[PDB]
Amino acid sequence: MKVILLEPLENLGDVGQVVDVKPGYARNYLLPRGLAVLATESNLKALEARIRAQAKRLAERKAEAERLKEILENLTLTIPVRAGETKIYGSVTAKDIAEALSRQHGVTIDPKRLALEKPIKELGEYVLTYKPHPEVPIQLKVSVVA
Amino acid sequence: SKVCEISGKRPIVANSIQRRGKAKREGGVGKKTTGISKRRQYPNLQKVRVRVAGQEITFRVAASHIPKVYELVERAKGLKLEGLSPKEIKKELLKLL
RNA sequence: GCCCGGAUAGCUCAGGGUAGAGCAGGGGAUUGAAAAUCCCCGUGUCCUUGGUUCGAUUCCGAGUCCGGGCACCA
RNA sequence: UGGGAGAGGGUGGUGGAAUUCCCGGAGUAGCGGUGAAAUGCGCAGAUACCGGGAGGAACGCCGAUGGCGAAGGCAGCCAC
RNA sequence: GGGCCUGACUGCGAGGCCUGCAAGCCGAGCAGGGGCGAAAGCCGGGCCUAGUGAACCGGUGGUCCCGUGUGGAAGGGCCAU
RNA sequence: UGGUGUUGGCUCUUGGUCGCGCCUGCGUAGGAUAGGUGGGAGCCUGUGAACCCCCGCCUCCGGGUGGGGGGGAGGCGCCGGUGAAAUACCACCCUGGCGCGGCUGGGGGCCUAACCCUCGGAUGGGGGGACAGCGCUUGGCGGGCAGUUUGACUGGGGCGGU
RNA sequence: CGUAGGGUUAGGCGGGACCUAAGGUGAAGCCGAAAGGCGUAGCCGAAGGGCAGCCGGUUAAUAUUCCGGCCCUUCCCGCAG
RNA sequence: GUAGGGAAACCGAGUCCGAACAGGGCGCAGCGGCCGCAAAGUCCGCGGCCGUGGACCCGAAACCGGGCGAGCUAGCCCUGGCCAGGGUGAAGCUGGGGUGAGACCCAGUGGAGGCCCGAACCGGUGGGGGAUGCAAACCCCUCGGAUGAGCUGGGGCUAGGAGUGAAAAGCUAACCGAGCCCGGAGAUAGCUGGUUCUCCCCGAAAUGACUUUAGGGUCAGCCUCAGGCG
RNA sequence: UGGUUCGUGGAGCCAUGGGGGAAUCUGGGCGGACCACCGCCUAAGGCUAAGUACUCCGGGUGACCGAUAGCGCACCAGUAC
RNA sequence: AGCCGGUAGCGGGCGUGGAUCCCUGGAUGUCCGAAUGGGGGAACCCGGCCGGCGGGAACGCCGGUCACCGCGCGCGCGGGGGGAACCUGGGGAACUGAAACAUCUCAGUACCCAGAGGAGAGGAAAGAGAAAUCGACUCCCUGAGUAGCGGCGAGCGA
Ligand SMILES: [Mg+2]
Ligand SMILES: [Mg+2]
Ligand SMILES: [Mg+2]
Ligand SMILES: [Mg+2]
Ligand SMILES: [Mg+2]
Ligand SMILES: [Mg+2]
Ligand SMILES: [Mg+2]
Ligand SMILES: [Mg+2]
Ligand SMILES: [Mg+2]
Ligand SMILES: [Mg+2]
Ligand SMILES: [Mg+2]
Ligand SMILES: [Mg+2]
Ligand SMILES: [Mg+2]
Ligand SMILES: [Mg+2]
Ligand SMILES: [Mg+2]
Ligand SMILES: [Mg+2]
Ligand SMILES: [Mg+2]
Ligand SMILES: [Mg+2]
Ligand SMILES: [Mg+2]
Ligand SMILES: [Mg+2]
Ligand SMILES: [Mg+2]
Ligand SMILES: [Mg+2]
Ligand SMILES: [Mg+2]
Ligand SMILES: [Mg+2]
Ligand SMILES: [Mg+2]
Ligand SMILES: [Mg+2]
Ligand SMILES: [Mg+2]
Ligand SMILES: [Mg+2]
Ligand SMILES: [Mg+2]
Ligand SMILES: [Mg+2]
Ligand SMILES: [Mg+2]
Ligand SMILES: [Mg+2]
Ligand SMILES: [Mg+2]
Ligand SMILES: [Mg+2]
Ligand SMILES: [Mg+2]
Ligand SMILES: [Mg+2]
Ligand SMILES: [Mg+2]
Ligand SMILES: [Mg+2]
Ligand SMILES: [Mg+2]
Ligand SMILES: [Mg+2]
Ligand SMILES: [Mg+2]
Ligand SMILES: [Mg+2]
Ligand SMILES: [Mg+2]
Ligand SMILES: [Mg+2]
Ligand SMILES: [Mg+2]
Ligand SMILES: [Mg+2]
Ligand SMILES: [Mg+2]
Ligand SMILES: [Mg+2]
Ligand SMILES: [Mg+2]
Ligand SMILES: [Mg+2]
Ligand SMILES: [Mg+2]
Ligand SMILES: [Mg+2]
Ligand SMILES: [Mg+2]
Ligand SMILES: [Mg+2]
Ligand SMILES: [Mg+2]
Ligand SMILES: [Mg+2]
Ligand SMILES: [Mg+2]
Ligand SMILES: [Mg+2]
Ligand SMILES: [Mg+2]
Ligand SMILES: [Mg+2]
Ligand SMILES: [Mg+2]
Ligand SMILES: [Mg+2]
Ligand SMILES: [Mg+2]
Ligand SMILES: [Mg+2]
Ligand SMILES: [Mg+2]
Ligand SMILES: [Mg+2]
Ligand SMILES: [Mg+2]
Ligand SMILES: [Mg+2]
Ligand SMILES: [Mg+2]
Ligand SMILES: [Mg+2]
Ligand SMILES: [Mg+2]
Ligand SMILES: [Mg+2]
Ligand SMILES: [Mg+2]
Ligand SMILES: [Mg+2]
Ligand SMILES: [Mg+2]
Ligand SMILES: [Mg+2]
Ligand SMILES: [Mg+2]
Ligand SMILES: [Mg+2]
Ligand SMILES: [Mg+2]
Ligand SMILES: [Mg+2]
Ligand SMILES: [Mg+2]
Ligand SMILES: [Mg+2]
Ligand SMILES: [Mg+2]
Ligand SMILES: [Mg+2]
Ligand SMILES: [Mg+2]
Ligand SMILES: [Mg+2]
Ligand SMILES: [Mg+2]
Ligand SMILES: [Mg+2]
Ligand SMILES: [Mg+2]
Ligand SMILES: [Mg+2]
Ligand SMILES: [Mg+2]
Ligand SMILES: [Mg+2]
Ligand SMILES: [Mg+2]
Ligand SMILES: [Mg+2]
Ligand SMILES: [Mg+2]
Ligand SMILES: [Mg+2]
Ligand SMILES: [Mg+2]
Ligand SMILES: [Mg+2]
Ligand SMILES: [Mg+2]
Ligand SMILES: [Mg+2]
Ligand SMILES: [Mg+2]
Ligand SMILES: [Mg+2]
Ligand SMILES: [Mg+2]
Ligand SMILES: [Mg+2]
Ligand SMILES: [Mg+2]
Ligand SMILES: [Mg+2]
Ligand SMILES: [Mg+2]
Ligand SMILES: [Mg+2]
Ligand SMILES: [Mg+2]
Ligand SMILES: [Mg+2]
Ligand SMILES: [Mg+2]
Ligand SMILES: [Mg+2]
Ligand SMILES: [Mg+2]
Ligand SMILES: [Mg+2]
Ligand SMILES: [Mg+2]
Ligand SMILES: [Mg+2]
Ligand SMILES: [Mg+2]
Ligand SMILES: [Mg+2]
Ligand SMILES: [Mg+2]
Ligand SMILES: [Mg+2]
Ligand SMILES: [Mg+2]
Ligand SMILES: [Mg+2]
Ligand SMILES: [Mg+2]
Ligand SMILES: [Mg+2]
Ligand SMILES: [Mg+2]
Ligand SMILES: [Mg+2]
Ligand SMILES: [Mg+2]
Ligand SMILES: [Mg+2]
Ligand SMILES: [Mg+2]
Ligand SMILES: [Mg+2]
Ligand SMILES: [Mg+2]
Ligand SMILES: [Mg+2]
Ligand SMILES: [Mg+2]
Ligand SMILES: [Mg+2]
Ligand SMILES: [Mg+2]
Ligand SMILES: [Mg+2]
Ligand SMILES: [Mg+2]
Ligand SMILES: [Mg+2]
Ligand SMILES: [Mg+2]
Ligand SMILES: [Mg+2]
Ligand SMILES: [Mg+2]
Ligand SMILES: [Mg+2]
Ligand SMILES: [Mg+2]
Ligand SMILES: [Mg+2]
Ligand SMILES: [Mg+2]
Ligand SMILES: [Mg+2]
Ligand SMILES: [Mg+2]
Ligand SMILES: [Mg+2]
Ligand SMILES: [Mg+2]
Ligand SMILES: [Mg+2]
Ligand SMILES: [Mg+2]
Ligand SMILES: [Mg+2]
Ligand SMILES: [Mg+2]
Ligand SMILES: [Mg+2]
Ligand SMILES: [Mg+2]
Ligand SMILES: [Mg+2]
Ligand SMILES: [Mg+2]
Ligand SMILES: [Mg+2]
Ligand SMILES: [Mg+2]
Ligand SMILES: [Mg+2]
Ligand SMILES: [Mg+2]
Ligand SMILES: [Mg+2]
Ligand SMILES: [Mg+2]
Ligand SMILES: [Mg+2]
Ligand SMILES: [Mg+2]
Ligand SMILES: [Mg+2]
Ligand SMILES: [Mg+2]
Ligand SMILES: [Mg+2]
Ligand SMILES: [Mg+2]
Ligand SMILES: [Mg+2]
Ligand SMILES: [Mg+2]
Ligand SMILES: [Mg+2]
Ligand SMILES: [Mg+2]
Ligand SMILES: [Mg+2]
Ligand SMILES: [Mg+2]
Ligand SMILES: [Mg+2]
Ligand SMILES: [Mg+2]
Ligand SMILES: [Mg+2]
Ligand SMILES: [Mg+2]
Ligand SMILES: [Mg+2]
Ligand SMILES: [Mg+2]
Ligand SMILES: [Mg+2]
Ligand SMILES: [Mg+2]
Ligand SMILES: [Mg+2]
Ligand SMILES: [Mg+2]
Ligand SMILES: [Mg+2]
Ligand SMILES: [Mg+2]
Ligand SMILES: [Mg+2]
Ligand SMILES: [Mg+2]
Ligand SMILES: [Mg+2]
Ligand SMILES: [Mg+2]
Ligand SMILES: [Mg+2]
Ligand SMILES: [Mg+2]
Ligand SMILES: [Mg+2]
Ligand SMILES: [Mg+2]
Ligand SMILES: [Mg+2]
Ligand SMILES: [Mg+2]
Ligand SMILES: [Mg+2]
Ligand SMILES: [Mg+2]
Ligand SMILES: [Mg+2]
Ligand SMILES: [Mg+2]
Ligand SMILES: [Mg+2]
Ligand SMILES: [Mg+2]
Ligand SMILES: [Mg+2]
Ligand SMILES: [Mg+2]
Ligand SMILES: [Mg+2]
Ligand SMILES: [Mg+2]
Ligand SMILES: [Mg+2]
Ligand SMILES: [Mg+2]
Ligand SMILES: [Mg+2]
Ligand SMILES: [Mg+2]
Ligand SMILES: [Mg+2]
Ligand SMILES: [Mg+2]
Ligand SMILES: [Mg+2]
Ligand SMILES: [Mg+2]
Ligand SMILES: [Mg+2]
Ligand SMILES: [Mg+2]
Ligand SMILES: [Mg+2]
Ligand SMILES: [Mg+2]
Ligand SMILES: [Mg+2]
Ligand SMILES: [Mg+2]
Ligand SMILES: [Mg+2]
Ligand SMILES: [Mg+2]
Ligand SMILES: [Mg+2]
Ligand SMILES: [Mg+2]
Ligand SMILES: [Mg+2]
Ligand SMILES: [Mg+2]
Ligand SMILES: [Mg+2]
Ligand SMILES: [Mg+2]
Ligand SMILES: [Mg+2]
Ligand SMILES: [Mg+2]
Ligand SMILES: [Mg+2]
Ligand SMILES: [Mg+2]
Ligand SMILES: [Mg+2]
Ligand SMILES: [Mg+2]
Ligand SMILES: [Mg+2]
Ligand SMILES: [Mg+2]
Ligand SMILES: [Mg+2]
Ligand SMILES: [Mg+2]
Ligand SMILES: [Mg+2]
Ligand SMILES: [Mg+2]
Ligand SMILES: [Mg+2]
Ligand SMILES: [Mg+2]
Ligand SMILES: [Mg+2]
Ligand SMILES: [Mg+2]
Ligand SMILES: [Mg+2]
Ligand SMILES: [Mg+2]
Ligand SMILES: [Mg+2]
Ligand SMILES: [Mg+2]
Ligand SMILES: [Mg+2]
Ligand SMILES: [Mg+2]
Ligand SMILES: [Mg+2]
Ligand SMILES: [Mg+2]
Ligand SMILES: [Mg+2]
Ligand SMILES: [Mg+2]
């Protein structure tokens, strides 16, 4: 008897997988414990309706990240800081970089989504990895000048 | 055993025919009937307990139509069955037949 | 009729490369006897036929005879 | 009055050896029994071996030419 | 008693015996293909009279007659047992 | 009482058939452990040989064999001796093995959730448990019950005889 | 016996507006081709439980029933505690 | 009806069996002068007999279905009631005796018991009577039980292959080896009985064969009628 | 297993208590086992007058009865008993 | 033009201003009965609720209402029971016949039950069956005692 697993299970199959079980197992264990559902045609395409709705909401977000990847690797964030020859007096933090990004180029950015542990204390040119969604890591070239 | 609530199957009267002798198709003189008498054939009735709208419902149904019960449980999801008596839940469920 | 099998020394029980063993029998040993026991000795187309093989208890086929087993009977 | 030895008796407990049966395991062509045999038991797996269990009866060594009791009779060990 | 043989035939059968029916019995002669005999001829078991069982149901060999729209087939019929 | 339905989960050990893998096969004659046949003068070996340690092994007790640690130009065939039958390699197979995979069927242990019982408390707890019960089907026992049969002749009927 | 007329008077007697027994019926529920069979509660069900009237007189015919005498029960409303 | 023969295919005044042009089976067919009558055949009426129906009428013992009965009787359930009077004198208890203590013995008290005698009540042993009875089980005398496995009132439950039964196949509404009523139903009866006006002619049989047949049948024999023959 | 003329028969068809269990016209059922060919028809939802049966009731009519007949009842009968 | 039933009589009345009587509709319609407020040994008994009557609170009477089940979104609508035969469906004998008897017959009859209605069933092809055909069902004649079925018996029978 074909059923739709509603959870991963012991040597049975992954969630959403359609598996064949003895009818007794389905009627008196899986179904009354919400662990699965009989693969009737009605809620059988309701499965592919979801495999469609999620796959549309995933590929969407892997697209709305490229709409920042190509829009960030085609600029530079130049940040002025009062600094003596090399060393910044204050610093530039993630929040600073974000605040400066929305300042000049309007781009809004999650500073916690930016890979920078210690605040920058040196002048120079920096390339900092941004992660707005994995497998789309952005290389932001930033320029702390004086 | 009475009546399938789903299919309507009820006991039927059948004969029990006792035969002797070698069938003609095996080279015998033929079969002879040493007795016919009435008997009954019963549906393979079983209980099916399901839980619908937080109530327990029991069906007396022939094994053949056990699948038809859960099919009603599916079709009952689009119904507003809360607060109804278990007896009234059954009536509604059977209405979808 | 059909299936399953047998047949091997007088009796019986075993068995591709042997014709076996026990029991009955013969003599000897033994006792007081009846024996038990001990040694040796015998007693076969292995049912018949045809073929397989270098060879036939074997393997196959065909009869025969007797076992089994099963069903039917106007 | 103070002591002693003792299977003297009765009641309630309790210990180990052995037999038999039962279950598990391992194993195979005989076991048993006698003057010799036979009946009996064993390939439906006995005998012999190991482990587990149940149950009843009798108390090995000490133990003796011993002890105690009126006699009959009294023997594992413990308390009364 | 012996020699050769298979008529212990096939396809029929005039006419009778007997007889409630059904059965039972005798049978010349014609054809086919034979046996014995030189031939005339004889031979359709046995000197004779007991040694037997209607029909139904089924088996087997043959026939190729029927074959449920059609060709086949299943299953029947017919002859023999 | 078998099969099957209601009837499910996890294990363990099995048997039967199917396909493939590697073998096992030693009466006597003789190198030795010769399946049956056929092919065929080359198979091999740095794509690790002649020797030492582990064994799966099966041993008929003589041996056959593989993978491992050995190992760093060696092997055994045609040749032949007695064979019904030459030995290498290949190949299809016989009678058996086991290894894997397939369909399977058998048992045994456990689980709980169907089903059953039970719990003043019940969408629960406890016990039994895929057994039992119940459906369909198989064969069997079956005067408890049912329908019947149980001949005629005959110096009456039975008995006897026929 | 035929025709006709008359005659049976209860808050307290007996039963009901009270209780339950076997049993019957039976919301819940269970079962059965149909008819129907079960079934806890509940309801019904008495010669059992419970509950307030004794004596006398009177009629042709009733009387613990009418009358007389002396007693008593429940319900309703009110007053008092 | 006009065509039959063959298991059939099929052929056809033929056909089947067969090798047959053999044999055999079964088939094939008007009066007198084109006109009449008669006739194949068929239709309707009438009569005899036969088949199917209850089939000439009456009669079982029985079988089956659906109901009605435990106001009789049998058992059980619930709730009530009844058993005069007399007799016997268990245990225990008390006291006395007894003994180491006891067992035990004696007396008194006590009032047990499917105990005794006997009415009511419940029975029904023997005899007599009764026998178209007083009575479809009674009467007289006698006799059994009578605190019990006792009797009895009222309220209930169990029934037909079923109940109930201290068991007799007893009882289940005056006959129970399977109740009663209605129905299937006009069951069936090879048996027994019965079968109705008149006259005239003829006139049997009681044997054979076969028969779950023997006092019943089929055929033959023997009777009768119609047509034909002579 | 039942239905049909079909009693297991060569046993199809129609129905279905049990087990297994599809497809949507290039799908499916039938034409008497089965196969091929050739045809017929579209299952697993329902409704549908009329022609047909009967006679409690009304009328019409009898080569129907005429009080033991005709209904059990001509009448105060489903009564008396 | 007579009348107050069968039914005369006593005693009293009515009718051409149309009686009696006949047809239709209406009103009344105790109690029981499917019986339905509850109970019950049918025609009896006992209640709740609203309203009324009496002097009326107790008590009683009068009118209305109050069973259960199903269906529809407390309210509505429907069901219940009866009917001589007839009809359909669910169950379903035996005597008898086979001159015994079991398959078979009687017979899907008798009968029980449920249901329906003036009828009921059936009905618009997943049909027939051999015609290159027909064209729902029902009913009558015929086909036909045919085809077949059958201890190939008795019989049954499209
Ligand atoms: Mg900063
Ligand atoms: Mg049967
Ligand atoms: Mg055949
Ligand atoms: Mg038969
Ligand atoms: Mg038969
Ligand atoms: Mg039966
Ligand atoms: Mg059930
Ligand atoms: Mg279930
Ligand atoms: Mg559940
Ligand atoms: Mg099914
Ligand atoms: Mg199924
Ligand atoms: Mg002292
Ligand atoms: Mg053991
Ligand atoms: Mg022995
Ligand atoms: Mg042995
Ligand atoms: Mg063995
Ligand atoms: Mg013991
Ligand atoms: Mg001494
Ligand atoms: Mg001679
Ligand atoms: Mg000679
Ligand atoms: Mg010659
Ligand atoms: Mg000849
Ligand atoms: Mg002749
Ligand atoms: Mg003759
Ligand atoms: Mg005759
Ligand atoms: Mg003769
Ligand atoms: Mg000649
Ligand atoms: Mg000649
Ligand atoms: Mg010559
Ligand atoms: Mg000549
Ligand atoms: Mg001749
Ligand atoms: Mg001679
Ligand atoms: Mg016969
Ligand atoms: Mg024949
Ligand atoms: Mg043949
Ligand atoms: Mg032909
Ligand atoms: Mg056909
Ligand atoms: Mg054909
Ligand atoms: Mg062809
Ligand atoms: Mg042809
Ligand atoms: Mg043939
Ligand atoms: Mg034939
Ligand atoms: Mg034949
Ligand atoms: Mg079974
Ligand atoms: Mg199972
Ligand atoms: Mg377990
Ligand atoms: Mg288990
Ligand atoms: Mg559990
Ligand atoms: Mg558990
Ligand atoms: Mg539970
Ligand atoms: Mg539980
Ligand atoms: Mg549990
Ligand atoms: Mg089971
Ligand atoms: Mg089966
Ligand atoms: Mg059986
Ligand atoms: Mg018997
Ligand atoms: Mg009997
Ligand atoms: Mg009996
Ligand atoms: Mg029995
Ligand atoms: Mg009997
Ligand atoms: Mg007989
Ligand atoms: Mg006789
Ligand atoms: Mg006689
Ligand atoms: Mg005599
Ligand atoms: Mg005589
Ligand atoms: Mg005499
Ligand atoms: Mg005489
Ligand atoms: Mg005799
Ligand atoms: Mg008087
Ligand atoms: Mg009076
Ligand atoms: Mg008073
Ligand atoms: Mg009152
Ligand atoms: Mg009362
Ligand atoms: Mg009460
Ligand atoms: Mg109910
Ligand atoms: Mg019932
Ligand atoms: Mg009841
Ligand atoms: Mg009760
Ligand atoms: Mg009350
Ligand atoms: Mg009552
Ligand atoms: Mg009462
Ligand atoms: Mg009372
Ligand atoms: Mg009282
Ligand atoms: Mg009173
Ligand atoms: Mg007083
Ligand atoms: Mg007085
Ligand atoms: Mg008086
Ligand atoms: Mg007084
Ligand atoms: Mg007074
Ligand atoms: Mg003919
Ligand atoms: Mg011919
Ligand atoms: Mg001719
Ligand atoms: Mg001729
Ligand atoms: Mg004429
Ligand atoms: Mg006559
Ligand atoms: Mg006649
Ligand atoms: Mg008749
Ligand atoms: Mg007649
Ligand atoms: Mg009978
Ligand atoms: Mg009988
Ligand atoms: Mg009855
Ligand atoms: Mg009754
Ligand atoms: Mg009584
Ligand atoms: Mg009584
Ligand atoms: Mg009574
Ligand atoms: Mg009493
Ligand atoms: Mg008394
Ligand atoms: Mg007294
Ligand atoms: Mg007394
Ligand atoms: Mg006394
Ligand atoms: Mg005294
Ligand atoms: Mg006294
Ligand atoms: Mg005393
Ligand atoms: Mg006392
Ligand atoms: Mg004393
Ligand atoms: Mg004293
Ligand atoms: Mg005393
Ligand atoms: Mg006394
Ligand atoms: Mg007494
Ligand atoms: Mg006495
Ligand atoms: Mg006395
Ligand atoms: Mg006396
Ligand atoms: Mg008496
Ligand atoms: Mg008596
Ligand atoms: Mg008397
Ligand atoms: Mg006397
Ligand atoms: Mg007398
Ligand atoms: Mg008398
Ligand atoms: Mg008397
Ligand atoms: Mg007297
Ligand atoms: Mg007296
Ligand atoms: Mg007396
Ligand atoms: Mg007396
Ligand atoms: Mg007394
Ligand atoms: Mg007495
Ligand atoms: Mg007493
Ligand atoms: Mg008593
Ligand atoms: Mg009493
Ligand atoms: Mg009583
Ligand atoms: Mg009484
Ligand atoms: Mg009873
Ligand atoms: Mg009863
Ligand atoms: Mg009876
Ligand atoms: Mg009866
Ligand atoms: Mg009985
Ligand atoms: Mg008694
Ligand atoms: Mg009576
Ligand atoms: Mg009577
Ligand atoms: Mg009686
Ligand atoms: Mg009697
Ligand atoms: Mg009887
Ligand atoms: Mg009877
Ligand atoms: Mg009788
Ligand atoms: Mg009676
Ligand atoms: Mg009567
Ligand atoms: Mg009746
Ligand atoms: Mg009737
Ligand atoms: Mg009849
Ligand atoms: Mg009749
Ligand atoms: Mg009669
Ligand atoms: Mg009879
Ligand atoms: Mg007779
Ligand atoms: Mg008579
Ligand atoms: Mg007469
Ligand atoms: Mg005359
Ligand atoms: Mg004369
Ligand atoms: Mg004669
Ligand atoms: Mg005669
Ligand atoms: Mg006879
Ligand atoms: Mg006789
Ligand atoms: Mg006789
Ligand atoms: Mg006579
Ligand atoms: Mg007779
Ligand atoms: Mg005659
Ligand atoms: Mg004559
Ligand atoms: Mg004459
Ligand atoms: Mg004549
Ligand atoms: Mg004449
Ligand atoms: Mg003359
Ligand atoms: Mg039929
Ligand atoms: Mg059939
Ligand atoms: Mg049939
Ligand atoms: Mg058929
Ligand atoms: Mg079908
Ligand atoms: Mg089915
Ligand atoms: Mg198509
Ligand atoms: Mg298709
Ligand atoms: Mg079909
Ligand atoms: Mg089909
Ligand atoms: Mg077909
Ligand atoms: Mg068709
Ligand atoms: Mg068609
Ligand atoms: Mg259609
Ligand atoms: Mg249809
Ligand atoms: Mg209609
Ligand atoms: Mg119309
Ligand atoms: Mg119509
Ligand atoms: Mg009329
Ligand atoms: Mg009239
Ligand atoms: Mg007339
Ligand atoms: Mg007349
Ligand atoms: Mg009269
Ligand atoms: Mg009359
Ligand atoms: Mg007269
Ligand atoms: Mg008359
Ligand atoms: Mg009338
Ligand atoms: Mg009348
Ligand atoms: Mg009369
Ligand atoms: Mg009369
Ligand atoms: Mg009257
Ligand atoms: Mg007057
Ligand atoms: Mg006047
Ligand atoms: Mg006028
Ligand atoms: Mg006028
Ligand atoms: Mg007018
Ligand atoms: Mg009116
Ligand atoms: Mg009422
Ligand atoms: Mg009532
Ligand atoms: Mg009021
Ligand atoms: Mg007043
Ligand atoms: Mg008032
Ligand atoms: Mg008032
Ligand atoms: Mg009132
Ligand atoms: Mg009221
Ligand atoms: Mg009713
Ligand atoms: Mg109605
Ligand atoms: Mg009917
Ligand atoms: Mg019917
Ligand atoms: Mg019917
Ligand atoms: Mg019956
Ligand atoms: Mg029958
Ligand atoms: Mg019968
Ligand atoms: Mg009979
Ligand atoms: Mg008949
Ligand atoms: Mg008969
Ligand atoms: Mg007869
Ligand atoms: Mg008889
Ligand atoms: Mg019969
Ligand atoms: Mg029958
Ligand atoms: Mg009949
Ligand atoms: Mg029938
Ligand atoms: Mg009728
Ligand atoms: Mg009409
Ligand atoms: Mg209609
Ligand atoms: Mg249509
Ligand atoms: Mg048609
Ligand atoms: Mg057409
Ligand atoms: Mg059409
Ligand atoms: Mg039309
Ligand atoms: Mg015709
Ligand atoms: Mg038939
Ligand atoms: Mg028949
Ligand atoms: Mg038939
Ligand atoms: Mg019939
Ligand atoms: Mg028909």
JSON list of C-alpha atoms (C1' of nucleotides) and ligand atoms in Angstrom, two decimals, chain H residues 161-165 178, ligand 145:
[
{"chain": "H", "resi": 161, "resn": "G", "atom": "C1'", "xyz": [-38.65, -33.27, 18.76]},
{"chain": "H", "resi": 162, "resn": "A", "atom": "C1'", "xyz": [-39.66, -28.75, 22.88]},
{"chain": "H", "resi": 163, "resn": "G", "atom": "C1'", "xyz": [-40.49, -28.27, 28.20]},
{"chain": "H", "resi": 164, "resn": "U", "atom": "C1'", "xyz": [-40.74, -30.71, 32.88]},
{"chain": "H", "resi": 165, "resn": "G", "atom": "C1'", "xyz": [-39.65, -35.47, 35.21]},
{"chain": "H", "resi": 178, "resn": "A", "atom": "C1'", "xyz": [-44.28, -36.88, 20.46]},
{"chain": "K", "resi": 145, "resn": "MG", "atom": "MG", "xyz": [-36.47, -33.07, 25.20]}
]
